[PDB]
Design a protein around this ligand. Structure first.
Ligand code: HEM
Ligand code: HEM
Lengths: 145, 145
């Protein structure tokens, strides 16, 4: 359940999420597009879902991809800001979950974002410990799909 | 064009937007729900558009309305953070515009949000000058509808 998944965000996990977000959240445009391009590059089978964005290989030059990417980073900002209150975290998670359920995105496919997050964190010198923390947060969204 | 509208936002207008957002954006859950409930109170004809959120008169207790309201405040956060780069502002504005075009929300209907914004600003003592600044930002989105 979403609530049990949310319960897994312990004190250390929340700390690791905040500390790493201070760095990756400071460049939403750059890191957001990096996240998306890495997803498309490593999981080419997911590109079909993003038909509305056009030629996603254009990266930063594609305005639709840039707009989508920046907005996605604000969803993460949203999650981080709700870590203090699990009932609020759950209602925003469920809101975004619906955006993906309507696009027929399963829990398994949503989980494909973990690879890209691990790589982006790694490029900023944040290792496995941080990648695992982020996987826990992603797991909360997965529980709602 | 949307770019024209964005490019018309001046230094004094941006200053007023940021100064007022420092306050209204500090309690996203509270002011977000206040915005939505005020819209429903003053413009009852819009309630039907939000059927997905369920019984909106439940206010804060309605988890779906709460999730929506908090997320709406991050859309405004997004706009405020992109004020100095018109190209970035335009791409996020067009992204959110699509969310409304798909729901058949016209430019005139979107402008109905100005009343609620004016009232919420007034609750924190931000007057007409600030309401006009916000109407200019809303007009940027209207240029995309
Ligand atoms: C960190 C994880 C992710 C977050 C926070 C996230 C967030 C978002 C947000 C905020 C939107 C815009 C919602 C809307 O306006 O309708 C979106 C759209 C979308 N997401 Fe995700 N997403 C994530 C991962 C994924 C993954 C892994 C997939 C695919 C396997 C996916 C597929 C989609 C699709 C298809 C859209 C619609 C794009 C469009 O046509 O505009 N998302 N996502
Ligand atoms: C300050 C202005 C506004 C902003 C920034 C804004 C932002 C948003 C956002 C971020 C969403 C979620 C998009 C999605 O996930 O699909 C949304 C949904 C929606 N908005 Fe707005 N909106 C604004 C004003 C309005 C107004 C005045 C109306 C028209 C009465 C409107 C009607 C809708 C509807 C019908 C939905 C879909 C709700 C649902 O079923 O989830 N919006 N808006």
């Amino acid at each position: 359940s979403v609530y049990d998944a949310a319960a897994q965000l312990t004190a250390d996990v929340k700390k690791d999420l905040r500390d790493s977000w201070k760095v990756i959240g400071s460049d939403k445009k750059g890191n957001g597009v990096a996240l998306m391009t890495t997803l498309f590059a490593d999981n080419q089978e997911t590109i079909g879902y993003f038909k509305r964005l056009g030629d996603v290989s254009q990266g930063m030059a594609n305005d639709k991809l840039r707009g989508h990417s920046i907005t996605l980073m604000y969803a993460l900002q949203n999650f981080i800001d709700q870590l203090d209150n699990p009932d609020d975290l759950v209602c925003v998670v469920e809101k975004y979950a619906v955006n993906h359920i309507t696009r027929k995105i399963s829990a398994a496919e949503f989980g494909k974002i973990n690879g890209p997050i691990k790589k982006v964190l790694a490029s900023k010198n944040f290792g496995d410990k941080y990648a695992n923390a982020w996987a826990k947060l992603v797991a909360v969204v997965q529980a709602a799909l």
